[PDB]
Amino acid sequence: KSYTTPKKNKHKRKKVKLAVLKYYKVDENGKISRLRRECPSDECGAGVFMASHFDRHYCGKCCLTYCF
RNA sequence: CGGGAAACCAAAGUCUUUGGGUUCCGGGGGGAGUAUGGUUGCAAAGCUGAAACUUAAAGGAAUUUGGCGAAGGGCACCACCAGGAGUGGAGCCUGCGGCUUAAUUUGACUCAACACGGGAAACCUCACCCGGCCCGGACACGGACAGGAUUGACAGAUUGAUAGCUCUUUCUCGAUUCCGUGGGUGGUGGUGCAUGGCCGUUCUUAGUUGGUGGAGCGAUUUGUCUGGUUAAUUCCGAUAACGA
RNA sequence: CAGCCACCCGAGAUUGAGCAAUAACAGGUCUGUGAUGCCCUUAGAUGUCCGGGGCUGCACGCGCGCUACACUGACUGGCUCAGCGUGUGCCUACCCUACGCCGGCAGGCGCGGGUAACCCGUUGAACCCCAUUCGUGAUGGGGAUCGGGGAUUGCAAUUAUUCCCCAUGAACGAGGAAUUCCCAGUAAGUGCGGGUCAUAAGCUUGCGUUGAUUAAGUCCCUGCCCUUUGUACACACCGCCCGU
Ligand SMILES: [Zn+2]
């Protein structure tokens, strides 16, 4: 029920639509162009990408941060 | 002998196998030996004496535990005598009550609670408190679908932590899930005055019970006792009791 | 008669302990359990989990225990005698120690033994015995309180976990009313094992050494059991029942 102390809500992940639009760029030619840097770790595959931050990228379940 | 409901009775006997003669007197218990009327008396008060109403009991005899401010016995170093060590007085450890505390968690209060719960706890113990995350809400019904129902986290504000528990920021797991209702699980939450089991105490004292038979209409009683002995209802013995 | 006492012979002419009848307590345990009825909670938890704290906090009152008040003694050396036991784990990592060095000390590294009458271990235990110092003085009694330093256990010792070394040296002069336990290897003075245990016993249960004074009785006190008697009680005296 409603207690005296406030409670922060859980991390409700907002649904993002048409994410498959935002992975590759499509031109008149059939050659694709990836928009994200690829993770070279052997735990994940070659189809996964990295996170899109504003300073540096971030891998998936590998949780490895690579600088420049 | 006989009789009675039995205590008991040579009369309370000679009584359904009722009948010797003759006076007074009682028909559940209260109201009530009261009111009125008469009568007797100096007075107090004696004699005769109802009804209305109310109740399903009031009473008599007698056996077993019960309870005595009744009597008589027996046993016990958790009772005493004669003694030994002592405790209670001093300091320390432990437990309980009280005060105090955000909390100082709780049960047990004469034997039969207080170094007890196998309780000598720094953290787990923990059942108590200040605080924050994980779900360990199974399974069904109805909303959302592989285009995503969510878990897993990094320069920086942040408790407490590099628990991403949040907020800047999105690849990662793919139908294993999120949401409302039934329902389910977990609970050192409450009730031992609902219990089961276990244990303690009366009691570790020496006390219980049938079979046959005797007595009484019967409940019931003797056996299980006046006495002697023993740690002992342990034996002996007097004895309608023998055998267990 | 049941049996009792003393004596001779003979190891013992009463060694100790386990279970312990019918019936009953509103005795204790829902905090031993996945034994459990009902009730409460269940996502923002009364479950679970983590960090830290508190069960230990003190004007005070009570019960089990330990050390003492000393010369029947304290201190310092030497002599010499035991028995129950225990000892390397499913989860699991905490086993018992001989032997040679370092250090006054607790403790530190290697060489080993034992899955056990094999190794610790002939468990060289304490009390006791012998010889000096001390001399009735709150004193070499008593060791509370406390300061500094050094080690082990563990992630963490502060509200000293514990141990060791040096200082500190209070109360206490055999204790009021009251009260506990005990008849022979008994009480008592002493030590050693087991449980608790990561470090650990002023507690409990066992083992062993030295080892007595008094009693072979009673119902006075404290309780229990039984017989006789009385009952207007049978919810049983916490009973029944009279009157304004
Ligand atoms: Zn990767």
How many CA atoms are closer than 13 Å to the CA of A60, on its beta-carbon side? 15
- Tell me the torsion sign for CA atoms A56, A65, A20, A10: negative
Helix (H) or strand (E) holding A25: strand A24-25
Of A52, A56, A54, A53, the C-alpha closest to A67 is A56
Residue type, A63: C
CA at A10, C1' at B190: how many angstroms apart?
Answer: 35
Distances (CA, A) of A9 to A5, A6, A21, A37: 13, 10, 30, 33
A3 touches strand C (CB under 7 A): yes
Distance (Å, whole) CA A67 – CA A64: 10
Alpha-carbon distance of A49 to A51, in angstroms, equals 7
Experimental approach: cryo-EM
Q: What is the whole-number distance in angstroms between the Cα of residue A50 and the centre of ligand 1? A: 8
| DSSP for residue A64 | -
Amino acid A18 CA to nucleotide B172 C1' distance, rounded Å:
17
Q: Is the CB of A12 under 7 A from strand C?
A: no
- Cα A1 from Cα A64, distance rounded (Å): 41
